[PDB]
Design a protein around this ligand. Structure first.
Ligand SMILES: Cc1ncc(COP(=O)(O)O)c(C=O)c1O
Ligand SMILES: Cc1ncc(COP(=O)(O)O)c(C=O)c1O
Ligand SMILES: Cc1ncc(COP(=O)(O)O)c(C=O)c1O
Ligand SMILES: Cc1ncc(COP(=O)(O)O)c(C=O)c1O
Ligand SMILES: Cc1ncc(COP(=O)(O)O)c(C=O)c1O
Ligand SMILES: Cc1ncc(COP(=O)(O)O)c(C=O)c1O
Lengths: 261, 261, 261, 261, 261, 261
């Protein structure tokens, strides 16, 4: 559905239109770039619903919004607003350092970040409909996202090497998830939900790299709109994500991209 | 009496009138924002009784005032002034690092902060009429308040898991409170007094979040009056605290709030 | 004699007159505020005898002067000057880090600071006629003074719990004082000399707080004269010290005090 | 082929022409000096293919381009561009902190850095066609490059001292390479591929020093073009690399070189 | 001879004349205040002999000069200059951190600093004709000098408590001095040479304090000449040193001294 | 040949002429004061051969030049230039942190620094023709040079105390030198080559001090030429080095030297 797509962060209706025209499969509405806020020491929260609504009114692709980790009231509000997806985001200032939102009590689907298999499974267990890497937001450095997708893949493989079901159960207990969840992953060799790349995806090559590592899609941040040519960069990232294993196409969209970050 | 209400910090009579009009159940008189003072290294004490009295004269809702931890003479003075409640506040510069005020020797009711069950019970044992979270004053970050309310709830539940009354008694001894106090809490599953949210409540969503977590009311700080639209923000926070489990109402009051913190 | 009184630091003859008019029981002559000097890294010594004499000539209440810890020659000079009391003061730069002055070889009475029971007893043993808390000079934070008076009281009570006279004697040896001194304190439940509050007394409430904690009088520093209304503040502190147990009187003198510290 | 040659970093077509005229055996195309970028905290990536192509069009010697460690999509793009060599470079911001590129799946040859024998063998095992020291890029300090070439030589000699084939196999396992690779190196006393000097080569003397230590060629950085006389310096470095064992020639090219770094 | 006298640091012939007129028993010639130099990180050495000679030519009291610890050539030079005393001074930058000068190979007498009994005895053993405290030069804080004179006195007394000659010999070995030296001290209850106070003597009271603690004389530094009234201060210090146990005289010279340090 | 002489650092032909006229036995050509460079973080290398040659052409005394530690190519170049001595200098930025130059493969004589006996012997073993202390270059503080000459002397004496030739051999092994080298030193009681003082020699007295400590000559740095009177200072240092045991001569040359460092 969003599979194979690019979700783009947008801070205005006009940015959302550019995203849509470029071929984004969805847009992530936010009033403020948390990266900048974060480096300011400011508290970053759910965006003003009126701003999210102005973005929803400007495009016909799905709209996502972020809430603070554990902030189930921000989520209730965003859900009442009828956004299509809620990102329970570590990029905003966490509201609860112990508990994430009980996502399975909502009707709107959530995406959650994960750095490893344990995290991914706990998030899924809590009700996440979609997982993404945590990467390193606002840095334009793809290596954190790469590290997370590699780690989840590696841990899955390592768990498949355990030949005892008791050992498996002990791993599940350590992860704080139902053994049946872990066992399903080990049989299928993959998470039961889509896993998107997010955080530090700066170039078309970065996007294609994460797709080739096995991501189902990519989130790109506000860097797109700080580049000297946002429409061209946005379009190139979408093309790279679509044609992620076509080197000549990747060469063609990467050429003459102009000034980035 | 204040249950389900919002108490607002005010530094002038005109701010108190705004609080009253907005639907605040009470006002907390202070001559100086301790948050700013604190970051200045200044010593923050009881406010000048004349400034408190000017606030008392300007509204008909109850008025609270702060005194330094352990400062029983500041409390005697505030009590003679006939304020309605005394907040023995960690936000002011502590006067005694060992002993809190013997609040049960006063006729005026006290509110005290607590970070966990032990602290809450010691403060109640000393005579506190009301408990509030300590949160993180002046930061606009709700996570400390959330952490405290969660911790008290968790410790209560954990203590309910003990079956040895000797174990209970050992916990009470470690907490330095009468076992009968601890036992009453374990039976009722809750503190014998109201517990308010305080410190870092910045948005209507924050206020509702703490009510849903089981708080009985909320304190909001001077951030209200630093916002670009104080009356609107104050009103929205009161509405959210009242209708804390009505998402469409929460959506409505959160929309177009203007610039905060 | 000085019991129940306020001693005020003064740096000029005119300040001494204000102190006297306000009802101070004595004045503490000093040419320089050691608090400011201290924060300058400067060495603070006995004041010039000429400045002290100019203060002695301007009032008819007793005059005190400070000497550096261990500086028995400064004390011999101040004694020859005929001041009424000598404060061997940790606020000045210590002259001897090992030995305090042999005060019992002087005719003029000394006051010494103490942070705990051991210190108080050694100072009394050396010949101090009066003890005062060490508080935290120049900070306007009363909590150090409170801590010292609480500590002395607590240690006395703890020693009263011992019932081996051998244990008592072991405590006296650790404190480096004659067992008869310690035993006298344990029987009477108090020091054999007056104990005054000093260091960080900034408000009338602070003064009364220390009296209620059991001090016999208070020293106040140069903060009085940095306030926007010195005469009013000085008078209020004297009144609070006199009527330290009268809340309505305390309320009355604390009101509309103006800008402090 | 490149053996005995100098490869020069160039950031424009005109710099590439100078390199070629000076006698460089190849040029390393990069849009930005990663040294400067690095000290800016910026992320350094593959250069824009258009800038690389403009350099390829300006000279007839081979052109190299860098990709981030582990970034196999950048490499696929550069390969499609038909550069002659790909430098998987630790000077750019690493994309994968765990896995290097699977170089043996490409047709274009790669050069990789190595600090010791283990690193060199793993890079060769992954498919590197050429090894170079990692030196210390942008510092003009030759000692890191010297350290690496010395270390590889020393480790080879130390391994040649082992006479248990089991011990050899244990070393290969620790290095994570096939024992046959390690054994080949121990028999021939050298790596199976050319080893170039790179990082911190600032003077003709530095270039010759590394050749005498056994390197097969040298990479020089953008320092060449920051000197007061680039053509002269570039020519001198090429001459020194060619006549690395001829002291009078080395003297002649080192003389009157002008202002460096 | 110098016993009971004040030696004053002087940096010019005119300062030396003031010292002489004031009643100084000797002058210490130095071209630069090492205190200021020290805080500048500068290396402080023997003063230019021409400057020392200009001072020797301006007064008829003895002149001293400083050399760096261990710098026996500076001493040979000063000796050839015919100064009356050489101060091997820790205030200058040490030339030898292991060995002091072999003073007994010179004809001119040396003064050396000591912080404790061991140091004093080693210096005497090396040939020092006179000992002084090290104090804390340029600080105007007398407490270091007090500490050293107290420590030497205490260690002497403690050694007199040893009733075994073997124990004594073990102490001497630890001190690295001949047992006969230590034994002479223990019998006489004092050092075999005069011990002067030096470092941080700022007031007449300070000078008299050190005399009453048992010093045989005092060194005062350049602080004298930075005071608002050098002649008056110099004269007062000499009088205090002469009449060190006459309190009314000490009172008289300490009065109206003007601005110090 | 240089024994009993002063070698002076010079940065221009005119400075070299001054050195020559002053009686320097040799000059040390360098284009830059490494002391200043060092404090700038800059990399300091062999000087441009053209600047060295211009100095060689301006005087008829021997000329030395520095090369980086381990930089045998810089040495080959300087050797081809026909300088008289090569200083393998820790003052320049080391090129090899593991290996010094194989100096016995050169025809030109080398001087090397040493801090202790082990270092001196390894440098002699490698082929050094002359040893010098390392001192502390550019500081004008003679104590490091003093420390090194003292340490070498002390270690020689300590080794002479060993009676076990096996013990000797064990020391040689720890030092990484042939036992015959160490044994020759122990018999002769001295190094088999001249040992010069270097680093921090600022005054004529310093120079004489090091000669009396047993040095065979002295290196002085660029401090000479920063003094207010270079010719006078240079001449005084040469005279002091020549007449290093004549106090009245030392007095005469030390007088009225003007402003140093
Ligand atoms: C950024 C971030 N990641 C992860 C978590 C929690 O993940 P988990 O509970 O699985 O350890 C939190 C909260 O502590 C968080 O703020
Ligand atoms: C912020 C704060 N919390 C708590 C306390 C004390 O709480 P308790 O006595 O339960 O440890 C203090 C001072 O004593 C305090 O300053
Ligand atoms: C401020 C102060 N209080 C107390 C002491 C001495 O107190 P006592 O010796 O009793 O520990 C000194 C320490 O040297 C001191 O300077
Ligand atoms: C610069 C650099 N060298 C080497 C490595 C990898 O080398 P190896 O895996 O062989 O240790 C990496 C580490 O992640 C690296 O970034
Ligand atoms: C200031 C100072 N005091 C003392 C010494 C040496 O004294 P002793 O050798 O007795 O330890 C030195 C040198 O180390 C010194 O510089
Ligand atoms: C200042 C300095 N001293 C000494 C050395 C090495 O001396 P050794 O090999 O004897 O340890 C080095 C570099 O290797 C150095 O930089």
């Amino acid at each position: 559905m969003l599979k194979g797509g690019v979700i783009m962060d947008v801070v205005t209706p006009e940015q959302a239109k550019i995203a849509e025209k470029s071929g984004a499969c969805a847009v992530m509405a936010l009033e403020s770039i948390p990266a900048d806020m974060r480096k300011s020491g400011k508290v970053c929260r759910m965006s003003d619903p009126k701003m999210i609504k102005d973005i929803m009114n400007s495009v016909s692709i799905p709209v996502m919004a972020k809430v603070r980790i554990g902030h189930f009231v921000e989520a209730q509000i965003i859900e009442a607003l009828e956004v299509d997806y809620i990102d329970e985001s570590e990029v905003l200032t966490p509201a609860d350092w112990t508990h994430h939102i009980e996502k399975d009590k909502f009707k709107v689907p959530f995406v959650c970040g994960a750095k490893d298999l344990g995290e991914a499974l706990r998030r899924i267990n809590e009700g996440a409909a979609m997982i993404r890497t945590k990467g390193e937001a606002g840095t334009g450095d793809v290596s954190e996202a790469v590290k997370h997708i590699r780690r989840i893949t590696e841990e899955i493989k390592a768990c498949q090497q355990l030949k005892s079901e008791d050992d498996i159960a002990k791993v599940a207990e350590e992860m704080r998830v139902p053994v049946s969840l872990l066992k399903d992953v080990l049989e299928k060799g993959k998470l039961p939900v889509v896993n998107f790349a997010a955080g530090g995806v700066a170039t078309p090559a970065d996007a294609a790299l994460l797709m080739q590592l096995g991501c189902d899609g990519v989130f790109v941040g506000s860097g797109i709109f700080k580049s000297s040519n946002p429409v061209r960069l946005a379009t190139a990232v979408v093309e790279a994500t679509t044609h992620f294993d076509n080197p000549s196409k990747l060469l063609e969209v990467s050429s003459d991209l102009g000034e980035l970050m």
